[PDB]
Design a binder for this molecule. Structure first.
Ligand SMILES: *[C@@]12=NC3=[C]C([C])=C([C])[C]=C3N([C][C]([O])[C]([O])[C]([O])[C]OP([O])([O])=O)C1=NC(=O)[N]C2=O
Length: 108
């Protein structure tokens, strides 16, 4: 099934995206110049459920995995439903270094 993939740097305080797959840029309409070095939340908009945004904010603080269903918006403003799974990548000393994300457009 079609999916996209990003990597966030958890050594920086606000988890900026440091790598994105070609499908991520193609699905959202943003280019690497507007994606790299930024937190993923720019994809959110009016109808994004803050209860689910909270679930990811908390899971990132606690360094746990998480899977939420988020209303996101393309660059041209049109919406799409984003099934998002965030996975923590730890160093051998237990510290979280990166977060990785699989995003599926589940608008069907
Ligand atoms: C975004 N994908 C995504 C991928 C990774 C690896 C991580 C760590 C986060 C996301 N987010 C969410 C965003 O970065 C942030 O974690 C949340 O908005 C909650 O934090 P705040 O401080 O804003 O309450 C993703 N958010 C999206 O909307 N779409 C994704 O694809």
């Amino acid at each position: 099934l079609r999916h996209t993939f990003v990597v966030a740097d958890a050594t920086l305080p606000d988890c900026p995206l440091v790598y994105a797959s070609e499908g991520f840029y193609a699905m959202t309409g943003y280019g690497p110049d507007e994606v790299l070095g930024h937190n993923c939340r720019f994809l959110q908009g009016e109808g994004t459920d803050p209860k689910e945004v909270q679930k990811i904010r908390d899971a990132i603080k606690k360094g746990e995995a998480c899977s939420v269903r988020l209303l996101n918006y393309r660059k041209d403003g049109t919406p799409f439903w984003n099934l998002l799974t965030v996975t923590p990548i730890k160093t051998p000393d237990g510290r979280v270094s990166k977060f990785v994300g699989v995003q599926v457009d589940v608008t069907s």
